[PDB]
Amino acid sequence: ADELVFFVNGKKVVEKNADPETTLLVYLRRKLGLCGTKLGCGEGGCGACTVMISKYDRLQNKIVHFSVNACLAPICSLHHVAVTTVEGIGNTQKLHPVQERIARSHGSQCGFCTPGIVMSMYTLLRNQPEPTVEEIENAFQGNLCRCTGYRPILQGFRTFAKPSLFNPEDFKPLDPTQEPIFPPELLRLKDTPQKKLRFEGERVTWIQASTMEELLDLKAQHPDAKLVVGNTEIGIEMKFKNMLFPLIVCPAWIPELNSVVHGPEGISFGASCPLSLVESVLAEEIAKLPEQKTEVFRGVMEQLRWFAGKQVKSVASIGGNIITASPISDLNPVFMASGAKLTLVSRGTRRTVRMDHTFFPGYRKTLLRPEEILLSIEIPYSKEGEFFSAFKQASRREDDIAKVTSGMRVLFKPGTIEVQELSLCFGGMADRTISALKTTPKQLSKSWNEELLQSVCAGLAEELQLAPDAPGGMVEFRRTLTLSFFFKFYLTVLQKLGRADLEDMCGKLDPTFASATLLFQKDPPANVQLFQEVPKDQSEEDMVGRPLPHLAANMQASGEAVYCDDIPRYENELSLRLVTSTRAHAKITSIDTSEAKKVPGFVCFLTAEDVPNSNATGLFNDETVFAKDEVTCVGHIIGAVVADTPEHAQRAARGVKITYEDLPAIITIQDAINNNSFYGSEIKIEKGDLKKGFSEADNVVSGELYIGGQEHFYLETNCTIAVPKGEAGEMELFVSTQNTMKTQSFVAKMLGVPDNRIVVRVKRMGGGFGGKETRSTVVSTALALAAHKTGRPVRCMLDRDEDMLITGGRHPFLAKYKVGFMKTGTVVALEVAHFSNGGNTEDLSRSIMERALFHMDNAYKIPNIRGTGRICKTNLPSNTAFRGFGGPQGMLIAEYWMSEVAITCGLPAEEVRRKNMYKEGDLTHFNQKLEGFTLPRCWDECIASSQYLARKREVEKFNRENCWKKRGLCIIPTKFGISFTLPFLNQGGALVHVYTDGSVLLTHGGTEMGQGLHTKMVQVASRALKIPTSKIHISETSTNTVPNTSPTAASASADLNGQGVYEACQTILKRLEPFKKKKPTGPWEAWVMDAYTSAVSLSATGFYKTPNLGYSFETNSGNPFHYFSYGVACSEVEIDCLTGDHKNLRTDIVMDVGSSLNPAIDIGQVEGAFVQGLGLFTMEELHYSPEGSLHTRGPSTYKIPAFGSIPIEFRVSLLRDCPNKRAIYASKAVGEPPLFLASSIFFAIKDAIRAARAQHQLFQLDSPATPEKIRNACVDQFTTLCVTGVP
Amino acid sequence: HFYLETNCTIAVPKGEAGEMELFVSTQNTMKTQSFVAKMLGVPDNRIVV
Ligand SMILES: Cc1cc2nc3c(=O)[nH]c(=O)nc-3n(C[C@H](O)[C@H](O)[C@H](O)COP(=O)(O)OP(=O)(O)OC[C@H]3O[C@@H](n4cnc5c(N)ncnc54)[C@H](O)[C@@H]3O)c2cc1C
Ligand SMILES: O=c1[nH]c(=O)c2[nH]c(=O)[nH]c2[nH]1
Ligand code: FES
């Protein structure tokens, strides 16, 4: 047959024309309208699309439940399953316990990741109603959150395992009998045989094979037929590498491919067995068998720990990993090292082979005949005297791709330490899984000793060569890991020989080496959140300073919260796809749309010619709407395809052929320096006498620092819907933007209509972080144009790869410093030259450099100082605002030379920082006076609560007692100036209505992006009006309610909009006063109705401007900032000197947020900002080709912090008794200032590296301090052999 | 009356907090809002006409 039949939230779906290219995510959202399930990446790395599948498993004979990525699940694989989405488990009328707890524990900020995380936790509970803490963490290996810093999610969910921010005693208990029935029809159908099915789409035919005979017959007659089991590789090939397999066969149903059989030599798994099943089977075997027999099983398990997450492992098959034959397979090295036995079949044939180097003859090839399939793999029992290790080092532990991965096996002659067999196999060192076949033969009959160690390392260094040009780079690191992994195996086998009672023959392990061989384990988290209770006397209805949950948290947990692309399509709505430059700098010689036009549903291709009025856009009017004559970066938008559906728009975009003639490209900061290519002139702040300071200085240190940029990775990408109204040029846009005003202005200028025709509406964003302050408009303008031209609504949401390529990021910085200082650590002179890479338009680049210069002091009084900045103009995507806006880059440079001062003086870093710190009343280098300077309080509190001094003693002891792991510890302060650097942007407006039922509709210029701005404004309005928050509502942000709004940026939006709201409320109260006087007790509703029937206006605007701002670079005078934020963080790390991996052991933060408007939201901002900083300085790296093409375009390669990344002990205190009388209700801004405090981790790492270097001098550590950079800096016997040589 | 356009309403539920937006051929936005809000039992502030 040919109908596809499945269930969704208990409702039967019958699809009569299933297309094999249709994903479950698209089917749920676009066909069924269930938009709780989100698109975050389309490549399995984010979990935002997580749903649960239930089925009756014929082989285990029972109902099973597992999680999947809907973005990679073909609907054609789902016949006779039952899907559950976030909508299926609960809603705001009756929240599931999972939904309730994540909301109430402040686990949801922007909300875009919340459904997927809910479904991960929900699936766990359906499988294990009483999970462990570890099981809970493990449920989320495949889920990302960019806002929360993960802490609150795990803390809320810990309640399921085994003053306060939330109260777990009010959480309703779980009743598992109340979960949805497994669809009774499906149980009835488990008693009918499966028949073969065929589904035909636009391009692809899918056969769901029911028997082995059908599969073999098919592959005999049609060897082209592409096997799909999990689709976790094929889905990537199709979506990202434009590969089309017109015939697909799915064999998942076939019993022989799903069998597990225990044999004498090992356990045989059907090739279609999911990795989840391999894991559960091997775990039971390992628990029950002798250790001597499970060495290989434990190797596989160790790799599967770090293999994707639960969603991928539920459907990814063991045979699929093998045949995919990726160079970076984590399993094939283990299978090759252990000689695992593979059975291959075709119609009428059967052969068995042992995986060895022959199995993989070439890039992504096996020795399978085209008509052959893999039936089974036998993973072997280990023998007496046979030992096994497996290793993986990546950029991040959880859900990442191996840089190097390995399986290692040794067999000893019985009763000896003499080698009978030795196998070292590697991924990530060639275009296939390889064996070190030259090195290992030579060690046969040798004893396991130092000479074998040295011989194998010399062999590996020669045998596993990498060309300077090898894909992925990091050749020194990768080579170093092969030797380092072998060292670990060498030491591990010594220990294993030990436990076999042969310690006399091979050494005992030196106890300072034992930590080298430990398998990773973190430890259960311990968290502390400290904040100040409001006064005893405060009304219970006054929520200012109380930890009120985000007003939309319940709806976010339930998937009812509406983001742009969740808005239903009009019946006549069209889809837009942007077409971008594949050259960094080139002339457009021609455009050929001939193939585009043949795609069904194609409407038109828009280019510069179609722009009605002006093609000049961007904040400084130096950008094109659409390229004209030349392209100036890879990612430069040339045009936009308009089609009926996003699929057809994508296909048509591929048929737009562009011909180019290259022009000289300027890529790097050095390129731009050499070509004098800059945005405007040098910016400079200077004070005192540099000549004099350097002459007075006992010591002078010079150096440079490079700081990599950063992708925002808002979980919701850029999105616009433009709705033309058909009259008078009127158009309404629904946009994920922090900047309604510029969106409106830019659309209006492009169309050539007045601003009064264009309305921009923002309900909420799934994150922004500065990325949607300006760069959102490159989508909005294109969609507006399409809508105008067609007279039809048009929509575009970027795919993650498009968004990462087009919209830019944080500015990379290169700095050259020279610092003068006394032997006491007192700094007397500093000169810093900053360079940033701005890319191909000015955008905010100059203002970012100004803030970096304003923060080049960090917390330190420096009497003689000079900083300069230059913004490089390059052929790269334009970089823009990212939370911190140049602050983090400025301050990291300051801390970097400060670290070298302390080292050079031989004084404790904390004493050097402390004695250079500003004091109350000092002037900054830009002559602003520091009043209400709480930094010393933050410092003293942090030093004391973190027990910094005693912890220094423990770090020193650890470092003396361990050779191959080291700890480091650092405490870092910060000062962060609050207000836009452009004075007039420090303004905000509100509009309030009171309706005659007493209910209040509030709006302001600020946009909700997960920071809890609307929540705070409601708290504010409720205090100002003296009514419960329940009577006040904010529905959205719009240009036609509050005009001329600044972007929601500069951490200032609650300050500005708070005042605006407060003033609007004061006007209403003034009007109600006479009614209050006449009816002093009679309720609010009676005053309102009395005012109304007296014809008194119940609508008011409110407005605020920050007073007394305006700095001059010419005179180094005037205040850029209204006040400053302050905080301190102390962090401890433990590095792996052999791999570059590290654990974040503990972080303690004390943050001055004034009198917090909402301590729950403010702690959440501290934690979220801190963890983005942690990413910036230690994990997140973008790579570009020499020709300026971004390689890094999804979560597979761009590694943001994961649940497993965060400090194990994570303590956050908000400073007590520090009212800030010049912001709303004595609060301070919080969004950006905490981010730089994650430098504490960077400097703790730097400390640990210094200890490692003393073990095996102002060494260079650039940002980010990734495993590559950490490992490479830990110079030893192994790095020496890999960088050039001398054996 | 024989208005050439008869009575007509489009009601668009927003799925959040009882929020609803109505496109109406009416001389009386206020009473439309009131009457909808009262029928549903939500505050006036959720209902836009
Ligand atoms: C987010 C993410 C993270 C990942 N992480 C990792 C990781 O850490 N390590 C790792 O090694 N991989 C990783 N992968 C790769 C992928 O998950 C594995 O390769 C998985 O095992 C592929 O299995 P599948 O059943 O989904 O294969 P499919 O995609 O269905 O098929 C893959 C290939 O195998 C073929 N095939 C399948 N079964 C057979 C058979 N019996 N005989 C012949 N050919 C067959 C198909 O024709 C196809 O060529 C990751 C993928 C994703 C999306
Ligand atoms: O001074 C600032 N101006 C901005 O426009 C902005 N944007 C941002 O994210 N931070 C800041 N800071
Ligand atoms: S959208 Fe499916 S994993 Fe990201």
Ligand code: FES
């Ligand atoms: S709350 Fe998790 S991505 Fe925003």
